[PDB]
Design a protein around this nucleic acid. Structure first.
Ligand code: MG
Ligand code: MG
Ligand code: ZN
Ligand code: ZN
Ligand code: ZN
Ligand code: ZN
Lengths: 162, 162
DNA sequence: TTGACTCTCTTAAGAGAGTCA
DNA sequence: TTGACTCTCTTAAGAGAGTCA
């Protein structure tokens, strides 16, 4: 198995490569009517992506390193968390974009949490709008708001009470 | 079926049958430290479920009616909304449980909205904790809270900024 | 060892359709 | 006509693994 030192070396080479990705400045809602700035390190749209990186899906990538003649491969956003527990409360840990920008690989924009926690950030009011995430959101979730509900609760007769 | 009269007849027979489902009282968090009471009309756990109803998945049912010698079938929670647009902004409309209780078929606990709006209610703080849904939530979402994040944003070197 | 492709899978909110009796 | 089963599919947040040079 890869040693602690070898895993740290993988994380360091990953950081070195991602740090050379184009850095894009994005102005983002924070909640409470305030605006903030996030700096995303964005993987390219097409090959080549960077040393060790390859695309396995439209917005999915993997990182690959060969150590002592053995090929090791990880989901491209999972590498910052290789020294962390990989499950919690019986749920698999997932890489979760605080910036909601899938191409971004900035490890300061990622956290490591259940898929439910991950998804729920899409609707968070944001760090200045009432976020209660213990690992605080960096921005208001892109889907926060009144929604676009087409039809509400209703009955034709009188068979029901709320 | 095709006619408005036929659709109204479908909605009326669906309501009459669902109106005979057992009424189960659920006490629920509203947000803001308050509690409320919902009365869910719950489809039975096993056959027979009621006239026109059949189970197609562990928590999936369909409603079936024969009109003009033709069988017409719908997802069991979609029937209240048969006169509504079936899409919004190019997104499919879905039956959305305000009570977060799949077996419930109370139309006073259902709305008709995109899958994203539907999902997002799982994390809503609720009608007394700051819900901003235009069609208001009936309860705080079951997944609302601080989360259980294992690891937060972090870097080993000095290549990244927020 | 490495790049650039290929494929299918997970989850939990939701769907459509066929086989028998 | 009605009931009680069977199967796979959709979405958008996420994954693992194979082939070839
Ligand atoms: Mg996410
Ligand atoms: Mg729902
Ligand atoms: Zn980012
Ligand atoms: Zn948050
Ligand atoms: Zn209900
Ligand atoms: Zn709400």
């Amino acid at each position: 198995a890869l040693t602690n030192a070898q895993i740290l070396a993988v994380i360091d080479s990953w950081e070195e490569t991602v740090g050379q990705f184009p850095v894009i400045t994005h102005h983002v809602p924070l909640g409470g009517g305030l605006q903030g700035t996030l700096h995303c390190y964005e993987i390219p749209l097409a090959a080549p992506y960077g040393v060790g990186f390859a695309k396995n899906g439209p917005t999915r990538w993997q990182y690959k390193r060969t150590i002592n003649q053995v090929v090791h491969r990880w989901g491209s956003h999972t590498v910052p968390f290789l020294l962390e527990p990989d499950n919690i409360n019986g749920k698999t840990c997932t890489a979760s974009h605080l910036c909601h920008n899938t191409r971004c690989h900035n490890p300061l924009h990622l956290c490591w949490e259940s898929l439910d926690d991950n998804k729920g950030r899409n609707w968070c009011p944001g760090p200045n709008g009432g976020c209660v995430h213990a690992v605080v959101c960096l921005r208001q979730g892109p889907l926060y708001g009144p929604g676009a509900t087409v039809a509400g609760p209703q009955q034709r007769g009188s068979h029901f009470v709320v």
